[PDB]
Amino acid sequence: DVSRFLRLYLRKEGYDFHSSSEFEIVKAIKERACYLSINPQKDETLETEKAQYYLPDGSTIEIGPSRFRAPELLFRPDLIGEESEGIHEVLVFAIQKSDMDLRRTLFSNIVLSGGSTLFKGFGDRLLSEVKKLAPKDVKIRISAPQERLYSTWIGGSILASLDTFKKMWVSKKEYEEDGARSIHRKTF
Amino acid sequence: DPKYADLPGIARNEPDVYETSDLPQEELTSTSVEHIIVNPNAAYDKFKDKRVGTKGLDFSDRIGKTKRTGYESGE
């Protein structure tokens, strides 16, 4: 929807798009050109570049306010017209969902992932968000290679290469017997 | 006789006009959309004295606060 939102910005400055393939090209534009200006208001007061990338034909693709203002909506979700909390507050609530006799480790426990997250002005600015949120004495220990997507596949690969893994799966005959409830029982 | 014997090559007896002869929605059945009988003064009295105030009438795509909604001061 951020890409669709980008497309919205495009029409806002005269660039209408509607096809599926068209939308995918916009996706490539987004994931190809996006960052996060750490100081929203401040950087807004300043002047941009609006450097243009070119279409397959070669047309104007300016930077605009877009590639940094649009991903901030993930942190100010109400601008899309939806009351939400933003990853930062979400994780903070999750910390509140934890226990005080463990939260210190949880301050150290920062296992980040997500492939969409791979943009500029993301991690460190989000750490500044944490600084504004988390109290004193918090240790940044962020899991952040760009292959965290693949890391899931890899973790499952090594997971598959195991001994107890046999009992971990679901037998086919179990489906032949009941399946459903047993599937929920083995996955929990 | 303006030019009869003078010049025998000028038009006359011409009926160049080319005559003829004298031989000469509201499908409200549907239940689609209404209309309102215009009375500009009635609606004028409807929106009679709405003292709408524009304190900080800002609707830019600026990102620095919570939300922006101008045209907010009243009486």
CB contact under 8 A, B63 and A78: no
| Dihedral angle sign, alpha carbons of residues A141, A146, A149, A155 | negative
For residue A24, give the H/E element and its range.
helix A20-32
Shortest Cα distance, chain B CAs vs residue A67, angstroms: 14
- Percent of chain B that is helix, strand, coil (3-state, to 5): 10, 5, 90
Method used to determine the 3D structure = cryo-EM
Q: Is A42 helix (H, G, I), strand (E, B) or coil?
A: helix
Backbone angles phi, psi at A92, to 5 degrees: -65, -40
Q: Does A79 touch chain B (CB under 8 A)?
A: yes
Tell me how far apart the alpha carbons of residues A89 and A128 are, in angstroms, rounded to a whole number: 13
Chain A residues near residue B67 by CB distance under 8 angstroms:
78
Tell me how far apart the alpha carbons of residues A36 and A74 are, in angstroms, rounded to a whole number: 11
Resolution, angstroms, 1 dp: 6.7
DSSP A154: H
> Rounded to the nearest 10 degrees, what angle do helices A2-12 and A20-32 cross at?
100
The count of residues in chain A is 188
Q: CA A18, A22, A25 angle in degrees (round to 5)?
A: 140
Q: CA A149, A6, A33 angle in degrees (round to 5)?
A: 55
Where on the phi/psi map is residue A86: left (φ > 0), alpha (ψ -120 to 50), or beta? left
CB contact under 8 A, A41 and B61: no
